[PDB]
Amino acid sequence: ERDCRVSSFRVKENFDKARFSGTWYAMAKKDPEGLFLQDNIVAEFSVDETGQMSATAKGRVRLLNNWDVCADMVGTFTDTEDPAKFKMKYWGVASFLQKGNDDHWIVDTDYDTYAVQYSCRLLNLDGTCADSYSFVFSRDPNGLPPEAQKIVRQRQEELCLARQYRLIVHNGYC
Numbered sequence: 660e661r662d663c664r665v666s667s668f669r670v671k672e673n674f675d676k677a678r679f680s681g682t683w684y685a686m687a688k689k690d691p692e693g694l695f696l697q698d699n700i701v702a703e704f705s706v707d708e709t710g711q712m713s714a715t716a717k718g719r720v721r722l723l724n725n726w727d728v729c730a731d732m733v734g735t736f737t738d739t740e741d742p743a744k745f746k747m748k749y750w751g752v753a754s755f756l757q758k759g760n761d762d763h764w765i766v767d768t769d770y771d772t773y774a775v776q777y778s779c780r781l782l783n784l785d786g787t788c789a790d791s792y793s794f795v796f797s798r799d800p801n802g803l804p805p806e807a808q809k810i811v812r813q814r815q816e817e818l819c820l821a822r823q824y825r826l827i828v829h830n831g832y833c
């Protein structure tokens with residue numbers, strides 16, 4: 660009976676790009692089809708004077724045949740009418756790395772502790788998402804405090820994803 664229509668999902672009110680800048684460690688991920696970033700995922704968010712948000716990311720990716728590489732990715736965000744919803748153009752510093760353009764929603768954050776991100780790449784005909792991914796980010800690479808963990812779990816459930824996350828390990832591979 661819970662609403663899993665993407666159009667129903669709440670996102671961060673009055674999202675503040677400047678407060679969001681800096682280092683975010685991925686603690687958990689819900690994978691999309693043909694997943695790219697595997698683990699050791701660390702993102703760096705910036706804003707320029709124009710107010711344009713951008714980011715970089717490091718992480719182990721596993722090209723099939725069991726070949727691991729540390730991908731180095733770049734993203735630039737185009738604003739929409741909702742301050743928490745963006746279009747993210749992304750590519751790798753190496754051109755053979757995956758490129759594309761995904762929706763990028765900041766579903767919730769408190770800026771200094773946790774963030775929950777969401778992207779629906781493709782809708783179902785009933786408004787639910789056919790192909791989604793989601794990152795949970797922490798400022799501390801050792802994980803979230805209990806109060807933040809509990810908030811995040813609630814958001815995960817609201818996105819209809821709470822059963823579908825896996826933990827992201829950080830072991831200095833990159």
Ligand SMILES: CCCCCCCCCCCCCCCC(=O)O
Nearest residue numbers: 694695696702714716732733734749
């Ligand atoms: C959304 C993650 C951090 C945002 C920074 C964007 C920098 C480019 C990272 C590309 C993410 C594309 C891969 C996401 C889906 C996946 O990993 O399977």
Ligand SMILES: [Cl-]
Nearest residue numbers: 805808809812
């Ligand atoms: Cl709990």
Ligand SMILES: [Cl-]
Nearest residue numbers: 820821822823
């Ligand atoms: Cl669960």
